[PDB]
Symmetry: C3
Subunit: 340 residues, 3 copies
């Protein structure tokens, strides 16, 4: 909600309360999404200032607060700054922002990140370009310098984050993307390569001096319809865990496919049919292994901009015989949302 | 403070800064409330939306920020989401909300949780129903479907939270409550039973396949007077610690009594006289043990809705000879509050 | 930004997004400021209420959110409440506030804490009086009871914080300060003494039953000019680490000197020339050791109250041969700020 606007500075303070539960049999140690309470809160600010006519300065910070911890010691778990950045919109020339942000690859995969609860499984955190990373300078251009309508690109720069964990680390990298949006239709291309950290390289799973993530996208956003498809391929790039031998690291190569079909009904209900499969070719010890394999049945009922309840249900195509030992049970997710 | 209201959505953003100190002799390792700096901050949102005339959607998130940590490593301690939920108010039919929230039992014990600083000692966090728990679906009804004025109930559903700690865990449970409020007078009844987690059952202290919490309440809220009484009984339900043998778990049974007397003076000062005693019958190794035993002398001076300073002083009726080894010294608490 | 004002209560909700990077060679394990992503967010409230004409109640809470963590486990690092307090402004008689706050000494050292990114190196957290501490009651007086224009003092009371760490701990103490501000010119005096905690005393580095911090200040705030000088001396007061023998504690004595020269250009750019040197006399094992020794070249470009980018560059006068083993390389800092 816009809670400030004077002298050309406008500040939006927004949040939500998403009382949420997940439903699976057993512990759900072996289901897709887990089992039990999953409630969370968000709060953040989109700020924006006009420096002149030709110039606009902005900044954003969003934070995940978890509602499923006891007020004791586990009190802090899964709390995080999801976004924190700042930039300058120059008239027609462009827009530059540094901070923690979505990587250029997400300019593509984002398409199929539209399910009520789940979906967007290839969009990992601190996975170079496919999700939200820290230390990303991005230059984005709208309408090719204002000359070609709906033709947009972005060129991104990733800054070596050497962390205590290989999963969360990353080296120096570069990336880009181009999307063209002719009349409800949008097709996206996106690519990023990165140096790997020496800790990532001294992993058991994964082999290369370089991680790579590229994805193509297609969508139809019109007439209350959402159709979207995604094809991606990660090289030494997606993170994985042998749950049997308790081993960690990266998949040498992945081919990933995500498809979403959604229609928005007038009265509110937004039914959702989707599919997601990621598979890792040539993993060490195991060969070819599925990570994510499921069909999606779900419906968000919107009451207005602020209120909604959703049912999201992942029919898991993973068989119990999983070689990386992923979950094979189904996960039903039910939620009630107040956003502002 | 209400910081947004347009198009039928109203958002309240509220917080406080409570510079607070506690006063006890020695380390106060043996006093009632501790000793030293106790300053904290709160921030949260009560949001509310009108879906139509007959329908209202809401959500809340409140967060405890601690002010007594050094900016180093201890920086995060005692930080927590206290509330995070969402629900639907249907006209006269009712109101349903899931999330982290106060348990139905608190519909009773709440009465005597009115002291400036202390009091409400039987209202534990993640203690099933007596305080704030995670994963509670609640259906509350006002005025018995709008037919009997001031006659209210609630039926609650608790969702198995299997956690790393027995103190913080809990299984599947159900609860309810009825309160009737005839002219300043209010009498409450409240009951909840729950399955226990296998970790809770493999505790040294406590024995049963089930925890139980019921409490009765009475109050007089009128003429600047607050009188309230509470009688409760927890079965395998209240948590406790043998500080001698460093043992943990639950009291087999507790009888708990809380009484508050308060008058509000015109100019501002709200003097407060109160008493609280919890005792655990049939604890393992120890027999009958007092947990909380004290008298309360205190006064909140209110300047307005936003400003206040309070003195709260707990004369501790625990004798030094305590068999669970509780604190026996008095604790003086002084505070200065800016809320909004 | 002021987001609430009705019925005499005014509430400011303010924050920022500071996408920030630091530039150093090697790991920068040996540079002045580190190397890599350094983005952070802040959010807090300055609230204020009028109790009558003669009386004003206030409260503040500010919080540091870090933007450079992966969304995993390192997710929480360097998060902290920086301020959390409350107080009463009585007409001409004065103003009293308890909570977590800047210590009276900071009433002096504050002067040279004006660099774009760095500077103010002697202003440590939970270092008694020189920075932000927890459990400080402060009485501040403006214009000597409204009788001598621009003549101000403060008398402060520090409350024993016995913590898990000596670095972060502190005992019972008292402090004060007087500053007089004749026409752009301001000269400050400030002093504080404190009992030391037994854990601090059982440190290898440092010797005394008492820590002391006093600092003098001078400034010229006029005509778009900022000149300021600081002289300080800490006794058993500044914290330090032998990185060779991995030893911790306090410098027996420090003399500290900070100087800032800044001019504000009309169009926006604020160039900044500065210097900072702290040295510890009579440290155990080592003798005399420099802690901070550098020159400061930098420029904040302001677009308006909300937008800015800065370059800050510390030419490090520490030679590689450091006896406490401090960093000796230079650190370039680049940042982009949205505040509100
Ligand atoms: C206030 C608020 O946050 N409301 C809200 C409700 C339901 C939502 C979202 C917001 O979307 C953001 C979800 O945050 C998860 C990060 O986004 C993401 C990244 C990678 C893969 C999948 C992701 O989204 C999950 C589902 O988002 C769709 C709607 O969920
Ligand atoms: C902004 C703000 O929080 N102001 C404030 C000042 C003084 C208060 C309260 C709020 O009440 C909420 C206190 O939070 C503790 C949770 O409530 C609770 C649970 C169980 C037992 C006792 C409890 O309250 C402690 C005292 O509350 C009375 C007024 O305190
Ligand atoms: C919204 C926001 O916080 N904006 C902002 C941008 C740049 C800044 C500051 C704020 O100043 C506050 C910096 O916080 C650090 C605490 O202050 C401090 C203490 C001790 C020594 C040095 C300090 O300041 C560092 C630089 O501050 C100057 C401007 O930085």
């Amino acid at each position: 909600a816009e809670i400030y606007n004077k002298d050309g500075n406008k500040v939006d303070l927004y949040g939500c309360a998403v009382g949420l539960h997940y439903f699976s049999k057993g512990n759900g140690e072996n289901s897709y999404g887990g089992n039990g309470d999953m409630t969370y809160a968000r709060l953040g600010f989109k700020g924006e200032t006009q420096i002149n006519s030709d110039l606009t300065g902005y900044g954003q910070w969003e934070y995940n607060f978890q509602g499923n911890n006891s007020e004791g010691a586990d009190a802090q778990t899964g709390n995080k700054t999801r976004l924190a950045f700042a930039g300058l919109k120059y008239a027609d020339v462009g827009s530059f922002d540094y901070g923690r942000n979505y990587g250029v690859v997400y300019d593509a995969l984002g398409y199929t990140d539209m399910l009520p609860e789940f979906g967007g499984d290839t969009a990992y955190s601190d996975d170079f370009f496919v999700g939200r990373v820290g230390g990303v300078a991005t230059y984005r251009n709208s309408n090719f310098f204002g000359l070609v309508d709906g033709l947009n690109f972005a060129v991104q720069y990733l800054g070596k984050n050497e962390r205590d964990t290989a999963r969360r680390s990353n080296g120096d990298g570069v990336g880009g993307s181009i999307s063209y949006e002719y009349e409800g239709f949008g097709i996206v291309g996106a690519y990023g390569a990165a140096d790997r950290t020496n800790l990532q390289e001294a992993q058991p799973l994964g082999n290369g001096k370089k991680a790579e993530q590229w994805a193509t996208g297609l969508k139809y956003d019109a007439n209350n319809i959402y159709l979207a498809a995604n094809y991606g391929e990660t090289r030494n790039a997606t993170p994985i865990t042998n749950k049997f031998t308790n081993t960690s690291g990266f998949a040498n190569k992945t081919q990933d496919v995500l498809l979403v079909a959604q229609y928005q009904f007038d009265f509110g209900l937004r039914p959702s049919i989707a599919y997601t499969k990621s598979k890792a070719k040539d993993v060490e010890g195991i060969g070819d292994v599925d990570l994510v394999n499921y069909f999606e049945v779900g419906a968000t009922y919107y009451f207005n901009k602020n209120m909604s309840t959703y049912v999201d249900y992942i029919i898991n195509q993973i068989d119990s015989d999983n070689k990386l030992g992923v979950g094979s049970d189904d996960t039903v997710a039910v939620g009630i949302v107040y956003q502002f």
